[PDB]
Design a protein around this ligand. Structure first.
Ligand SMILES: C[C@H](CCC(=O)NCC(=O)O)[C@H]1CC[C@H]2[C@@H]3[C@H](O)C[C@@H]4C[C@H](O)CC[C@]4(C)[C@H]3C[C@H](O)[C@]12C
Ligand SMILES: C[C@H](CCC(=O)NCC(=O)O)[C@H]1CC[C@H]2[C@@H]3[C@H](O)C[C@@H]4C[C@H](O)CC[C@]4(C)[C@H]3C[C@H](O)[C@]12C
Ligand SMILES: C[C@H](CCC(=O)NCC(=O)O)[C@H]1CC[C@H]2[C@@H]3[C@H](O)C[C@@H]4C[C@H](O)CC[C@]4(C)[C@H]3C[C@H](O)[C@]12C
Ligand SMILES: C[C@H](CCC(=O)NCC(=O)O)[C@H]1CC[C@H]2[C@@H]3[C@H](O)C[C@@H]4C[C@H](O)CC[C@]4(C)[C@H]3C[C@H](O)[C@]12C
Lengths: 321, 318, 320, 318
């Protein structure tokens, strides 16, 4: 997984979902009056509306990522072995499951400071959705038009990090990912000078020599460094449309193609989908492994509204046969 | 630039064009009876038809890359400083300009063996198209449904290589690009064993550790390595559409986004377009920096036929 | 700085000292009845005798590293910015200065277990030796013939780590150094198989291809990785002499030569000295940048006065 | 193997011998009137005196490396599969065996210019010293106080390269090794500026960050890069003693310790010996894997004078 933010003509938030199969992902709109039920807390019948990507099960929106009507976003990314959910209920804290976490925050919070105050006081409980859909360890990026935070709930407690670069992947923990950037300080967007030695006449026979050292593999640390470099150095766009186009290019630099990353099961990890939310305009844009054409749905009831993903390449054919 | 081939349900050939500006390139179809004129050789009045990408100047198709009706493809890629074009004509050679080279081969040859035979008799001469379009240094990938060759014309002469992997980028020369792969033999698609030492407990907290050491930057040698790793390991598709999708993902692994590669001039190098030719079906598929949605035109008079590129993002709004 | 342990025919502990300048360091033996004075604790008049390397100031042994008569070793290595020394006394603790730490542990402890029990009760306090000799940020490797620990005293408190590989350099903190090893699991001492793709005939035209990916620079994390690789894979010696030989080869893999590492002052950081303590035989072996020949000194252990041997800083060449 | 030159207060040449066993190497002085016999050329009764390292078989000095009385040095380094020795005699060339090569050059030449003239008319012939000492592929560094050349005799003939850096290891061929330096131009001896991005506050918590990217392994290409970086940046000494000390520190950067490099035989490759010749003072300095103490012998007869290497650690016990 890779999640990023971008500040341009509007303000954006999005992710690659990286997995060795598809859940049959869809656009899910949760209107204001869809009743959010909680395993261990009281229902909320009136809340902020959400748009995002996930699956519906038992008429519950299982968000992979989403935004709300105020342009606050939240994404769950794989965090195997580091996530620690409590086996105890707290009498003085909201006892919230991981699958309830996106609704709990995006339903009630208009910005990152409100999200942070609510997250500080949460008890994330170790309770699975169902036998079919068991828990797996996550961590979260939470973003608004101004800034982003990382939430990692581990054995040492609820950690909230200011995220100065608006980047997140998988393991390790965020301080380790941020520390890992320090050894790449020498990378550049332009042909560097010969600091190796002015006693040898080193030749440059192409462009891009300044990036040499940037890791190119799809390990989480490599994707965290490559996404950071690509995002922080990406050219400014003239329009919102150029920004969205640029955002999918940034997610592309860390995309996983089928065949380069074979999991323990022997299945191929790949970028199932990519998305870009325009936070200011509350619009979801997405692509899938199978379809390059961007698809847009805007957030404008007590029932979920769903649009299933097209998993076929939609080609503009100029001529037949 | 990066050019690749792929063998799947059908057989493919295509490239990224990486530059700091667009030339206003378009689809050009050159029909059988468009007359090819050469600066130092007899005109060809009747030839194979071409579909490709480039510009039309003075009613002449300046191809960046193209295929013919037989499914033979040819791409010119930047080769600055190494390309050497002769000021001298040779009476025992075909004297051909670099900009005439795609027409000369694709007009006349049905396959790579025929291409190699014609290249073996060539003398690439130092005459520019015009004062406004001077020669730049190029090398070529020539591919059919079965195999590919690289043509590099340098000070030491006309070099033709068998391309065992179907990959080409820019400098250096092909024997250096191929030799450069050897130090990456240890890379893997899978989590490796701890060979570092049995005496320390090294842990894996994520997938993709096998690839650690693959280069990520957009230098030509890094892109040669990354394209090769991505292409040779890419999963087989079950249909031609799955193959075209997979092809565009492979070119995506070595795409240049605006901002990460700033030239001597201070302009941003970027992937202007990406294309995939289906050689067996004679169909061109392409994308542009500005438009993710693939456009297709199939090769099915004596005048150039053109289809301008649309550089606007075509978004499906539900 | 790089500090290592090695287990062979005997058991060894030692370090590179990497600095911009020599500090006039020399061999210092502290005998059993040299009185150890502490700023905030009772003097120790009878203790284990020490042999190590450091400077003498106002008749006090300021050790860079040392062992005791029981073969317990301790080294202080640079840890700038991360080291945090307390401005206050702490209640149920021994209040010990950083310059007193080596005397405090090696004077009283015979093994790592005892060292750990003592460090658990310690508070390192922000008092300098003198105006001319202010405190620098350090962390410590403590080693015996069996095992080693790391001590890092930071803002979050006194941390003690089991050191499963017997390696320490500088920054970052020990959990970061250890985690950083994980990305190198694929390195090998032998020619690897082509796992890149069996669709391309990759050729091997020399030995050492298994190591490709091992970092070669003298940053502290690169030295941590390269020392770990060299030490864990180093061939076993047949004799104690072969072990000592090997130990100096291992420190050599992460030596800093003059010219490759230029500090902010313009001065080059370099390996001032390398040492190997034979813990079982209580013998200090050392080399200097200037002199390749190993010098040996054995633990002068009775008495009450510091005994010192200055470093030979000339190349001692066998002319036939 | 790694061979280097260094220019300081005097001028130096020397090498690491990297192998998985010892031949019982020794110092060999060949006097002026030891008769050099050649399998296919006229004997040389009077020549320049030699001091070097190697073995003596059948009263013949088999040098691994040596200098002569004029301060001209030559070293043979492993070059497996690339070295090609001729199965033909050439009437217009000197037909010299690989094991005669060092005597042929150092015996007759007073500097690298002269060496180049003689190599331009050599034919290295496929003729072994004996059944027990068969030919292995070599290439050569030839060095004087001013400059150095590399000789690689391959399938495509006798190649001679100016060596602008005074470094040699093993494979690949010299143009490939020099080309491979170009991707390291960004390395530095000082803490670099944050060029990665202004928008993130990257921290430096130690010294040596400028070298990040330098390869640390003992592959021939990694040793070439590392030796080059270490030698071109090494600090000047104010004395000859400080130069010799520095020289052993530079070779130490690319030394092979027992255990990190296992040959196809499963034996450990290690730096058997390191040497430093003072070319101006005609003095050999050497260390062995087993003895850190530097040993000196000066070049000051019909007979080889030889001193075995001590392979015991000579420790100063106070
Ligand atoms: C891509 C990863 C895969 C994680 C995983 O299973 N890793 C195991 C591992 O790597 O060891 C995450 C991101 C969003 C996750 C889903 C969302 O949180 C919504 C929902 C939450 C439920 O608790 C479990 C099912 C699921 C569909 C989740 C399945 C899966 O958890 C997803 C899709
Ligand atoms: C500029 C690019 C190569 C990319 C590049 O230079 N990027 C920077 C880099 O990689 O350093 C090349 C590829 C094909 C070339 C064109 C084709 O060969 C057709 C035609 C050939 C004429 O001789 C000169 C004009 C031109 C339009 C050429 C202009 C230009 O020469 C092109 C479009
Ligand atoms: C000053 C250097 C730190 C290295 C460094 O960063 N210098 C290069 C530079 O400044 O660029 C340290 C390393 C070991 C230190 C000594 C040892 O820790 C022992 C002892 C400890 C006392 O607390 C202070 C005096 C001193 C002699 C210390 C003096 C000095 O504090 C030394 C020698
Ligand atoms: C094999 C080594 C180089 C080290 C090596 O091969 N590396 C191990 C590896 O990388 O596998 C070379 C260097 C000098 C060579 C010798 C000298 O040229 C002198 C002499 C030359 C004779 O033609 C063959 C025997 C020999 C003793 C040679 C044996 C052997 O040919 C030597 C000693």
């Amino acid at each position: 997984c890779t999640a990023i933010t971008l500040n341009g003509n509007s303000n954006y938030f999005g992710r690659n979902l990286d997995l060795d199969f598809s859940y049959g992902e869809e656009v899910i709109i949760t209107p204001a009056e869809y009743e959010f039920k909680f395993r261990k807390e009281k229902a909320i019948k009136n809340h902020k509306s959400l748009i995002g990507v996930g699956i519906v099960a038992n008429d519950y929106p299982l968000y992979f990522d989403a935004i709300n009507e105020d342009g606050l976003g939240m994404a769950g990314l794989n965090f195997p072995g580091n996530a620690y959910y409590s086996d105890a209920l707290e009498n003085d804290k909201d006892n919230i499951t991981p699958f309830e976490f996106i609704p709990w925050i995006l339903g009630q919070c208009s910005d990152v400071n409100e999200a942070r105050n609510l997250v500080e006081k949460i008890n994330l409980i170790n309770l699975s959705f169902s036998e079919q859909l068991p828990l797996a360890g996550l961590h979260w990026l939470i973003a608004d038009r101004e800034k982003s935070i990382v939430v990692e709930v581990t054995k040492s407690g609820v950690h909230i990090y200011d995220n100065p670069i608006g980047i997140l992947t998988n393991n390790p923990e965020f301080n380790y990912q941020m520390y890992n950037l320090n050894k790449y300080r020498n990378l550049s967007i332009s042909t560097p000078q010969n600091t190796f030695s002015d006693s040898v006449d080193l030749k440059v026979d192409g462009t891009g020599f300044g990036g040499i050292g940037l890791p190119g593999d799809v390990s989480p640390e490599s994707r965290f460094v490559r996404a950071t470099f690509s995002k922080l150095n990406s050219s400014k766009g003239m329009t919102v449309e150029e920004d969205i186009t640029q955002f999918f290019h940034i997610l592309g630099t860390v995309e996983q193609i089928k065949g380069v990353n074979k999991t323990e099961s022997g299945k191929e990890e790949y970028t199932v989908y990519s998305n870009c939310y325009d936070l200011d305009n509350k619009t979801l844009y997405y692509t899938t492994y199978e379809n390059r054409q961007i698809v847009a749905v805007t957030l404008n009831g007590n029932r979920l509204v769903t649009y299933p993903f097209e998993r076929k390449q939609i080609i503009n054919k100029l001529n037949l046969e």
